[PDB]
Amino acid sequence: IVGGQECKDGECPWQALLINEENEGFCGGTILSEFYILTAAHCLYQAKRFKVRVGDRNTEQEEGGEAVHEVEVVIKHNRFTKETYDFDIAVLRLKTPITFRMNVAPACLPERDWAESTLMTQKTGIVSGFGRTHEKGRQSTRLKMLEVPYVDRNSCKLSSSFIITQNMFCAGYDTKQEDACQGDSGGPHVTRFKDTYFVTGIVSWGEGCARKGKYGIYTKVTAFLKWIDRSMKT
Amino acid sequence: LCSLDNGDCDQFCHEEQNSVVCSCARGYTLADNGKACIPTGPYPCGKQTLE
Ligand SMILES: COC(=O)[C@H](Cc1cccc(C(=N)N)c1)[C@@H](C)NC(=O)c1ccc(-c2cccc(CN)c2)cc1
Numbered sequence: 001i002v003g004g005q006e007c008k009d010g011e012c013p014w015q016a017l018l019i020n021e022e023n024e025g026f027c028g029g030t031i032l033s034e035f036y037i038l039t040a041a042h043c044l045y046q047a048k049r050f051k052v053r054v055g056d057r058n059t060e061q062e063e064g065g066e067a068v069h070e071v072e073v074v075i076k077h078n079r080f081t082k083e084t085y086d087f088d089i090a091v092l093r094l095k096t097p098i099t100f101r102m103n104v105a106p107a108c109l110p111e112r113d114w115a116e117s118t119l120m121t122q123k124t125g126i127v128s129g130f131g132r133t134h135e136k137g138r139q140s141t142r143l144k145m146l147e148v149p150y151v152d153r154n155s156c157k158l159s160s161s162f163i164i165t166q167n168m169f170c171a172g173y174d175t176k177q178e179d180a181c182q183g184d185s186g187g188p189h190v191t192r193f194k195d196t197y198f199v200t201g202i203v204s205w206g207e208g209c210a211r212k213g214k215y216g217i218y219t220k221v222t223a224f225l226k227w228i229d230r231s232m233k234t
Numbered sequence: 235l236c237s238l239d240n241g242d243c244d245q246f247c248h249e250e251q252n253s254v255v256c257s258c259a260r261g262y263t264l265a266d267n268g269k270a271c272i273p274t275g276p277y278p279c280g281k282q283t284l285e
């Protein structure tokens with residue numbers, strides 16, 4: 001997260017973190033329920049064996065609410081194609097259930113029609129994670145959150161050097177130095193409606209971070225609701 | 235209808251038969267006024283934890 005804000009105590013409880021054997025976080029995720037984590041499909045390539053950590057806000061210490069969870073099954077999207085970044089979604093089933101507590105709670109899955117008509121029509125969205133604080137910097141040590149405006153589909157299709165498929169959407173600023181970044185990938189994009197937060201996207205990609213005229217690209221969750229449901233049932 | 239003020243629903247809204255119908259996410263129960271959504275447990279989805 002570039003130019004964001006620190007997630008204060010219990011502000012971003014649906015945030016998960018994929019850590020490699022070296023215990024270093026390399027991608028984000030969203031808690032969907034006690035057993036499932038939503039993440040980016042392209043994150044499954046940056047590690048041979050990873051685990052999920054929840055309840056974390058400061059990789060510097062240990063507050064206690066933290067919990068590491070081993071992965072039982074990883075459900076990567078069948079049509080995900082590395083080259084185009086299309087179908088950038090995957091679901092992880094945890095070996096043991098997550099026990100909700102302070103800083104550890106799920107995000108709500110919305111209904112497609114309502115979400116796209118009411119949620120994605122909202123002015124802002126919220127993205128969070130332990131990714132870089134600058135384009136060429138190191139991973140963040142404190143969990144951060146950023147308010148990112150929904151970007152007009154055409155102006156976003158036009159700003160991008162690459163094809164913006166029907167499974168992606170834009171968010172962020174054109175010039176303002178605020179935007180997700182490396183490490184935040186797989187992380188949660190959420191929309192608040194009457195103090196209730198719904199999963200609306202997955203941190204996917206962008207050309208660099210917070211570059212002028214470039215936006216942040218997110219997987220369009222509302223397009224995979226049916227698939228996520230089936231994934232969480234089997 | 236659902237386009238006025240989300241139809242006065244807390245969450246999901248559908249315009250079935252020229253009328254508004256509210257519903258909620260998993261872990262919630264539609265209030266008796268058929269609009270509000272009541273959490274069924276201690277850590278309902280989408281809610282920031284302020285124990
Ligand atoms: C330092 O820079 C970063 O971290 C970003 C990644 C990244 C990750 C998460 C969020 C954001 C963001 N800015 N919102 C950016 C860097 C590593 N990535 C890129 O430049 C980048 C990512 C994808 C494409 C790309 C997309 C579609 C088709 C193709 C044709 N094959 C290429 C091109 C460039």
Ligand SMILES: [Ca+2]
Binds near residue numbers: 056
């Ligand atoms: Ca910690």
